[PDB]
Protein backbone atom coordinates (compact mmCIF):
# COMPACT_ATOMS: atom_id res chain seq x y z
CA UNK A 1 0.00 0.00 0.00
CA UNK A 2 1.14 3.63 0.45
CA UNK A 3 3.59 3.97 3.36
CA UNK A 4 3.53 7.19 5.44
CA UNK A 5 4.99 8.48 8.74
CA UNK A 6 5.70 12.25 8.57
CA UNK A 7 9.34 13.29 8.01
CA UNK A 8 9.61 13.08 4.19
CA UNK A 9 12.84 12.51 2.23
CA UNK A 10 13.14 14.67 -0.91
CA UNK A 11 16.46 16.43 -1.52
CA UNK A 12 15.29 18.82 -4.27
CA UNK A 13 17.86 21.08 -6.00
CA UNK A 14 19.86 22.85 -3.27
CA UNK A 15 23.51 22.99 -4.46
CA UNK A 16 23.66 26.62 -5.69
CA UNK A 17 22.67 27.68 -2.15
CA UNK A 18 24.93 25.25 -0.20
CA UNK A 19 28.00 26.48 -2.14
CA UNK A 20 27.17 30.18 -1.51
CA UNK A 21 26.76 29.76 2.28
CA UNK A 22 30.24 28.18 2.17
CA UNK A 23 31.75 31.40 0.74
CA UNK A 24 32.38 29.27 -2.37
CA UNK A 25 31.68 31.34 -5.49
CA UNK A 26 33.48 28.93 -7.87
CA UNK A 27 31.10 26.03 -7.12
CA UNK A 28 28.10 28.34 -7.72
CA UNK A 29 29.41 30.02 -10.90
CA UNK A 30 29.96 26.57 -12.44
CA UNK A 31 26.63 25.38 -10.97
CA UNK A 32 24.41 28.40 -11.79
CA UNK A 33 25.46 27.93 -15.43
CA UNK A 34 25.29 24.12 -15.16
CA UNK A 35 21.53 24.53 -14.57
CA UNK A 36 21.41 25.34 -10.82
CA UNK A 37 17.80 26.03 -9.76
CA UNK A 38 17.64 29.83 -9.74
CA UNK A 39 14.54 29.69 -7.52
CA UNK A 40 15.25 26.64 -5.34
CA UNK A 41 14.08 27.17 -1.75
CA UNK A 42 16.56 25.54 0.65
CA UNK A 43 15.56 23.89 3.95
CA UNK A 44 17.56 26.59 5.81
CA UNK A 45 14.65 29.02 5.32
CA UNK A 46 17.29 31.47 4.06
CA UNK A 47 16.52 31.56 0.30
CA UNK A 48 19.39 30.94 -2.15
CA UNK A 49 21.07 34.31 -1.42
CA UNK A 50 19.98 34.91 2.19
CA UNK A 51 22.18 31.85 2.88
CA UNK A 52 25.25 32.87 0.79
CA UNK A 53 27.32 33.50 3.94
CA UNK A 54 26.56 37.23 3.33
CA UNK A 55 30.36 37.52 3.02
CA UNK A 56 30.73 37.10 -0.77
CA UNK A 57 28.44 39.51 -2.70
CA UNK A 58 30.01 38.03 -5.86
CA UNK A 59 27.76 35.03 -5.12
CA UNK A 60 24.59 37.18 -4.85
CA UNK A 61 25.15 38.54 -8.39
CA UNK A 62 25.57 34.92 -9.56
CA UNK A 63 22.12 33.89 -8.30
CA UNK A 64 20.45 37.35 -8.45
CA UNK A 65 21.58 38.09 -12.03
CA UNK A 66 20.40 34.55 -12.71
CA UNK A 67 17.10 34.98 -10.83
CA UNK A 68 17.44 34.18 -7.10
CA UNK A 69 14.94 35.34 -4.47
CA UNK A 70 16.19 38.78 -3.41
CA UNK A 71 12.57 39.57 -2.46
CA UNK A 72 10.77 36.49 -1.06
CA UNK A 73 11.83 35.64 2.49
CA UNK A 74 10.62 33.68 5.54
CA UNK A 75 6.94 33.40 6.44
CA UNK A 76 7.86 33.05 10.14
CA UNK A 77 9.82 36.29 10.65
CA UNK A 78 9.84 37.89 7.17
CA UNK A 79 13.64 37.55 7.08
CA UNK A 80 14.25 39.10 3.63
CA UNK A 81 17.65 38.92 1.92
CA UNK A 82 18.00 42.62 2.82
CA UNK A 83 18.78 41.88 6.47
CA UNK A 84 21.44 39.33 5.46
CA UNK A 85 23.46 41.98 3.57
CA UNK A 86 23.32 44.64 6.34
CA UNK A 87 23.23 42.09 9.21
CA UNK A 88 26.66 41.00 7.89
CA UNK A 89 27.92 44.48 6.85
CA UNK A 90 28.11 43.57 3.14
CA UNK A 91 26.89 46.53 1.07
CA UNK A 92 28.03 44.93 -2.22
CA UNK A 93 25.14 42.48 -1.63
CA UNK A 94 22.44 45.17 -1.21
CA UNK A 95 23.75 46.87 -4.38
CA UNK A 96 23.15 43.64 -6.33
CA UNK A 97 19.68 43.16 -4.78
CA UNK A 98 18.66 46.72 -5.78
CA UNK A 99 20.35 45.98 -9.14
CA UNK A 100 17.66 43.39 -9.89
CA UNK A 101 14.35 44.73 -8.50
CA UNK A 102 14.92 44.19 -4.75
CA UNK A 103 12.14 44.58 -2.17
CA UNK A 104 14.17 46.95 0.07
CA UNK A 105 11.07 47.87 2.12
CA UNK A 106 9.90 44.85 4.13
CA UNK A 107 10.07 44.19 7.87
CA UNK A 108 11.61 41.25 9.74
CA UNK A 109 8.28 40.73 11.57
CA UNK A 110 9.59 42.12 14.91
CA UNK A 111 12.95 43.29 13.50
CA UNK A 112 11.20 46.50 12.30
CA UNK A 113 13.43 46.75 9.21
CA UNK A 114 16.81 45.74 7.77
CA UNK A 115 18.05 49.36 7.81
CA UNK A 116 17.43 49.53 11.57
CA UNK A 117 18.96 46.09 12.25
CA UNK A 118 22.02 47.28 10.29
CA UNK A 119 22.47 50.40 12.47
CA UNK A 120 21.93 48.62 15.82
CA UNK A 121 24.30 45.71 15.02
CA UNK A 122 27.23 47.53 13.36
CA UNK A 123 26.59 48.05 9.63
CA UNK A 124 26.25 51.86 9.54
CA UNK A 125 27.68 51.92 5.99
CA UNK A 126 24.78 49.59 5.15
CA UNK A 127 22.18 51.06 7.56
CA UNK A 128 22.63 54.52 6.02
CA UNK A 129 22.71 53.40 2.36
CA UNK A 130 19.79 51.14 3.30
CA UNK A 131 17.51 54.01 4.41
CA UNK A 132 18.24 55.63 1.03
CA UNK A 133 17.58 52.42 -0.96
CA UNK A 134 14.68 51.25 1.25
CA UNK A 135 13.12 54.71 1.78
CA UNK A 136 10.79 55.33 4.74
CA UNK A 137 8.07 57.70 6.08
CA UNK A 138 6.23 56.95 2.81
CA UNK A 139 2.43 57.28 3.02
CA UNK A 140 2.47 59.38 6.22
CA UNK A 141 4.15 62.73 5.45
CA UNK A 142 1.84 64.62 7.85
CA UNK A 143 3.20 65.03 11.40
CA UNK A 144 6.48 63.07 11.13
CA UNK A 145 6.97 62.72 14.93
CA UNK A 146 5.87 59.39 16.49
CA UNK A 147 2.16 59.00 17.29
CA UNK A 148 1.23 62.72 17.28
CA UNK A 149 -1.34 63.98 19.81
CA UNK A 150 -4.93 62.95 18.97
CA UNK A 151 -6.67 59.79 17.78
CA UNK A 152 -5.93 59.34 14.06
CA UNK A 153 -8.69 57.86 11.86
CA UNK A 154 -8.05 54.54 10.05
CA UNK A 155 -10.83 53.63 7.61
CA UNK A 156 -10.06 50.22 6.03
Distance CA(63)–CA(80), nearest Å, equals: 15
> Of 123, 82, 122, 131, nearest to 102 (Cα)?
82
Kindly tell me the burial class for residue 4, based on how many C-beta atoms sit within 10 Å of its own C-beta (0-12, 13-18, 19 or more). Answer: exposed
- Please compute, for residue 65, the number of CA atoms within 13 A of its CA located in the half-sphere on the CB side: 13
Kindly tell me the burial class for residue 14, based on how many C-beta atoms sit within 10 Å of its own C-beta (0-12, 13-18, 19 or more). Answer: middle
Distance CA(18)–CA(16), nearest Å, equals: 6
Distance CA(20)–CA(44), nearest Å, equals: 13
Domains of the chain and CATH, by start:
1-156 (1.25.40.20)
Count of residues making up the chain? 156
Amino acid sequence: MEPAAGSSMEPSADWLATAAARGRVEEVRALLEAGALPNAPNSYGRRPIQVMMMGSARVAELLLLHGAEPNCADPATLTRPVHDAAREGFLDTLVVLHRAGARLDVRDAWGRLPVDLAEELGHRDVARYLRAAAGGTRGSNHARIDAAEGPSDIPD
